[PDB]
Write a protein that binds this DNA or RNA. Sequence first.
RNA 1: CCAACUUCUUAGAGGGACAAGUGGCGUUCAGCCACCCGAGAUUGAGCAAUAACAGGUCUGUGAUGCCCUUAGAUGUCCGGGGCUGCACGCGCGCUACACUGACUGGCUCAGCGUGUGCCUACCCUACGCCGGCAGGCGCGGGUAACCCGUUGAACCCCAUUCGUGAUGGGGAUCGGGGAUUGCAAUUAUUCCCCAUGAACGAGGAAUUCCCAGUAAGUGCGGGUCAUAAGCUUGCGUUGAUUAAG
RNA 2: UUAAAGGAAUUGACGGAAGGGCACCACCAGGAGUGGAGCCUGCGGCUUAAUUUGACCAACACGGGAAACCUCACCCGGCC
Lengths: 134, 52, 73, 113, 64
Amino acid sequence: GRVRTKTVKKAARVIIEKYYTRLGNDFHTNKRVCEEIAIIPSKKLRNKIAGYVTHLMKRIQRGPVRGISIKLQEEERERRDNYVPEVSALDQEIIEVDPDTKEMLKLLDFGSLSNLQVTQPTVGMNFKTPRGPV
Amino acid sequence: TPCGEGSKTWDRFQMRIHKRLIDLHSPSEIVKQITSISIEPGVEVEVTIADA
Amino acid sequence: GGGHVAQIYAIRQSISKALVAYYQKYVDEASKKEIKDILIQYDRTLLVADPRRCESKKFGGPGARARYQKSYR
Amino acid sequence: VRRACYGVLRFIMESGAKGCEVVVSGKLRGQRAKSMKFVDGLMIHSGDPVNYYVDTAVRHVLLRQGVLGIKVKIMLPWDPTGKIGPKKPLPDHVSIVEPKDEILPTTPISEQK
Amino acid sequence: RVQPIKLARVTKVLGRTGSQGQCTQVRVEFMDDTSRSIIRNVKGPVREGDVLTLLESEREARRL
RNA sequence: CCAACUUCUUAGAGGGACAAGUGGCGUUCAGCCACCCGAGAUUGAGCAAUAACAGGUCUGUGAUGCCCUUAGAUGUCCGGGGCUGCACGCGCGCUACACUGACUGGCUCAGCGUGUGCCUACCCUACGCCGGCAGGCGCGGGUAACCCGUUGAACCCCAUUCGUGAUGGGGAUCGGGGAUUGCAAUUAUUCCCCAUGAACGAGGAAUUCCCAGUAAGUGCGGGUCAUAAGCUUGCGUUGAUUAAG
RNA sequence: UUAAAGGAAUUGACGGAAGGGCACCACCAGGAGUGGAGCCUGCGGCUUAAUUUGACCAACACGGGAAACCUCACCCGGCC
Ligand SMILES: [Mg+2]
Ligand SMILES: [Mg+2]
């Protein structure tokens, strides 16, 4: 009998989007911010919106919820763009191939242009997983 | 219901009427210029007879 | 107000919390907390008012919940 | 009954109405009565705000056969805060205000006035 | 013939049964070793964890 | 000015409760479950969609179509009578079958609300005296938080009598008398008094309603009302048992 | 002799067809009963000059319908 309706949830996700720096993990202060910054037409859904606002205060300070607010979003510009490594994941200059794929680059005239020490395929033909339910 | 058919339903109409009261030590001539400052159709104001 | 039984619960509540609000004002709350220690663990209702009330009648029965007897045949 | 109801349904909605619906019931073309209703817009039905956001008017039309029944109701807009529409906005929606662009939060600068 | 009337403690209640929501299943422990535990059915309000008395010890639970 | 105050009373504005706080569960989502604090962690209701029913109402309506009758009028009024007539069946109820009681006397607590009217005649009643009761006269008050009224309600409480009996349980049936309303009381309007004192000993199949101030017991007030409630609608009081081809 | 019979899909409604829910106008655990008796009051039947009539879960203390007359329709008379 607790479960909050659409108009309470959609009006509280628009608060936390747009006034996130002015909020906190207390109920009685967030009740007063939304009182002063949003036109609520009664007292009952006022603090019922403010309840779900504080519910999202602890919810998004633990991680990236559907959270288009600035600070959680600008911090992932230091993940997609930052961590470019000082040494590459590609440039190791010691990489392995197989005797058939070196024949592929042999007609590409890249046989001796490369270093490319080879590994051999372990000779079984044990692919194509066994059939039937057990 | 406008007849006897139905399921024994009843509607409950009510009219709450309010009443307030104020004494004054006023002269009975300036009472009218306190009376002539509101139109306010939904009230009913009465002034007590001056003999007290 | 009330009845023969609802008044002696009300005066029981009254004289129990009257000296509590006397002791929170004219002596310290250290004595008050010591005696409200007694008057809470033993049946809390000596200084809190019981909220439940008359719970009005409806238009289909003799009381508020029950109904008149339904007949079919 | 179909030409007359459209001219009135077009006329409420062009006067600035949040929604309206008209029901005309009676002996139409045919000997058994039926009801043509011509709903439009949004209209609330339950609660107390359908006491002052709506006005209802039920009238009768005495024709040569039977009697028709007109039933018109308009849902009134909140906007004017004045003559044509009510105050006290609809209780299930929230008007949030947009904040300002938040210039000068940076490094300190002091004046004397 | 005479079985010892064995008092018994319930662990986790396995939900209602009995085609009318009248009987519940308790899987008692036997008050001598909690290793030795059988599934049983009782009626009335149960209150998980408490102790109930068995006039008969082991026949069957709700199982076709 | 030979006192202040607002606790209780009355409202008015504002506050407060949001699953907010703490543990557990769940995709650590929505949420659920416990506890804390608190007056309260689900008070009770009003409105209430789309599409309908050959549901009910022409006997609510100067809402109304068509048909019928319209002066020896199915219009309207007056006198009388009937809708109450009883071998029977059924439906909502009221009082009961008793000692967890009935009498008699004591002692003690309510809430909701209503009251003199345009036509409209009649309202609620305190006190004082006549009567044994129903009632009757005098004298007031009230258009009402001002008077009835601090609404001295019943149950219950405390004492007395009765003792397992169709009993002092139950009060149907019925005779005689007395009052009040009304133009009129017989086919008893109602009320009062003395008498008469019937079934009924807890109710087969079947079935109804209901989870907390609930059910049930108990009275009280609106409606109807000149006269009047076993009805309904409200109120407290005692209080539980478990388609892009 | 006859204007349909029929096919394939669609939405319904229904199933003594499955799965998931829910409600004391459903049940369980219970309570108070009702159904038995006396009376009150409504309905059918009977009888009647007339016993006016509406309605048969969602009719039956319901037409707010507790009619002495009036209401009042119905029956017996007389006026206007
Ligand atoms: Mg009519
Ligand atoms: Mg006895």
